[PDB]
Amino acid sequence: YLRDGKSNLVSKVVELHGETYATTVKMAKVKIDAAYLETYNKAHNTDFALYPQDLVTFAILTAEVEMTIRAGEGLQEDKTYAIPVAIDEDAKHCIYLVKDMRNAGDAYKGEGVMQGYLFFEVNDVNPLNTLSFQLENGKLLWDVVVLFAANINYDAEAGRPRVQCNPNVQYLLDNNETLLQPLRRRGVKVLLGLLGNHDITGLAQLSEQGAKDFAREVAQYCKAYNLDGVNYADLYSNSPDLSNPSLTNPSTAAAARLCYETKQAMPDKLVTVFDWGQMYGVATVDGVDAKEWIDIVVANYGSAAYPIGQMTKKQCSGISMEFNLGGGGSLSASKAQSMIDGGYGWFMGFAPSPAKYGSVFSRLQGGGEVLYGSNVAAPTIFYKKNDPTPYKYPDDL
Ligand SMILES: CC(=O)N[C@@H]1[C@@H](O)[C@H](O[C@@H]2O[C@H](CO)[C@@H](O[C@@H]3O[C@H](CO[C@H]4O[C@H](CO[C@H]5O[C@H](CO)[C@@H](O)[C@H](O)[C@@H]5O[C@H]5O[C@H](CO)[C@@H](O)[C@H](O)[C@@H]5O)[C@@H](O)[C@H](O[C@H]5O[C@H](CO)[C@@H](O)[C@H](O)[C@@H]5O[C@H]5O[C@H](CO)[C@@H](O)[C@H](O)[C@@H]5O)[C@@H]4O)[C@@H](O)[C@H](O[C@H]4O[C@H](CO)[C@@H](O)[C@H](O)[C@@H]4O[C@H]4O[C@H](CO)[C@@H](O)[C@H](O)[C@@H]4O[C@H]4O[C@H](CO)[C@@H](O)[C@H](O)[C@@H]4O)[C@@H]3O)[C@H](O)[C@H]2NC(C)=O)[C@@H](CO)O[C@H]1NC(=O)C[C@H](N)C(=O)O
């Protein structure tokens, strides 16, 4: 089979932060197969446009061949383009999903650095508070943020599980242009959190068909509200009704099915998991390795995440900080160096709030110098719930 040589993935998202991106295609010759894009889009129910062929150069396989992707100027941003490359019948193709991020760089801290993953308890805290967190050199600390959380619940009137949004979640989605998109314009990836919610449905207990449908609903939410993917957290569900065709016995295999189907439905977006309950641990679905469908795994406070399948620690958190309750440690110089030495890709934080910024920022001292050459700066603004106005920190608290 054919795959991208650097990631070993048959489907690879490329974010352009400069004018060029170089990789290999690994198996003969390779070619861009524009006709296949219709087949790919039909299979995934996607609508990616073909990346301009004149921007892609191959150095015949030597088997591998160098491929360079150049950034262009005619294209629409916040849009994913495709490079379908062709040498079972699937093993004849791989795909690059290309996004130009040159103008949405404020969270991009460089190649090979650790990245931040932050959950907001949106019942209480405006996610615009992401903007309170910058390094002294102006970069935004938190590459990825989660709206914690929409729920999975049974819709009795429709006879199926659904995404169920409480009034706070729904208000953010309804107001996404003013309360979520300002983050995306600056390069932050905004994920919808999904969480169990005290009925027969759960993220690790959907049947195969139930998981396919719920995955497709989650993808529809991410498309409609212009979001960047999902986090799944398998907590708070009750025992399933095994007589219900949408449900099955809770298991890591059922959870993996949901993750796999979600990536299939939104292959250019992030599929991420909290490692708790039955949400994580099975490394293959339908012969496809987990590196292709778990982009980020974050662990419970006080633990580090671990990779499965072909994943590495680059897809894993090395620290998880509970910013409301205090546990999980600090992102100190010594911890930052430890995590780099261990090859971890992420640090996770949960439930920061402006009233506790003294605590939160105390726990971010020293680490930024090690990770980025620039410490986290003291905050000067904050946001109130549901209010787009930047307020002065700490005076306006
Ligand atoms: C058990 C245990 O412990 N567990 C644990 C877990 O938890 C974890 O997890 C993880 O972590 C984190 C932490 O860290 C978390 O978070 C958390 O969570 C929690 C829980 O939650 C859940 O639940 C709840 C409750 O529920 C119940 O109730 C209700 C009413 O109330 C109802 O409705 C329901 O239904 C339920 O009931 C039912 O069931 C039950 C049982 O279950 C029974 O009993 C009954 O009968 C019935 O049936 C809820 O609420 C929640 O939900 C919510 O939210 C979400 C988000 O979050 C969403 O999604 C949803 O939707 C919801 O919302 C909505 O609704 C509500 C109501 O409900 C409203 O209100 C709203 O608005 C909306 O609408 C879930 O489900 C919780 O609790 C917590 O919370 C807290 O925090 C936060 C922040 O973070 C805030 O925001 C809040 O508010 C709160 O706060 C509070 O608290 C705190 C402390 O804690 C503080 O800080 C503050 O300040 C406050 O305070 C106050 O209060 C308190 C009391 O509470 C007192 O104390 C004080 O004094 C004051 O007053 C949080 O959220 C999470 O989840 C996770 N994460 C992730 C990432 O995922 C785990 C792991 O870590 O771990 C565990 N543990 C263990 O495991 C241990 C072992 N076992 C040993 O042994 O060790």
Numbering used by the authors: 49 to 75, 87 to 118, 122 to 124, 132 to 156, 167 to 476
Text of the article:
ENGases are endoglycosidases that hydrolyze the chitobiose core of N-linked glycans (EC 3.2.1.96).
EndoBT-3987 has a predicted signal peptide (residues 1–25; SignalP-5.0) that was removed from the construct. In order to obtain the crystal structure of the enzyme-substrate complex we used a catalytically inactive version of EndoBT-3987, in which the residues Asp312 and Glu314 are mutated to alanine and leucine, respectively (EndoBT-3987D312A/E314L; see below for further details). EndoBT-3987D312A/E314L-Man9GlcNAc2Asn crystallized in the R 3 space group with one molecule in the asymmetric unit and diffracted to a maximum resolution of 1.3 Å.
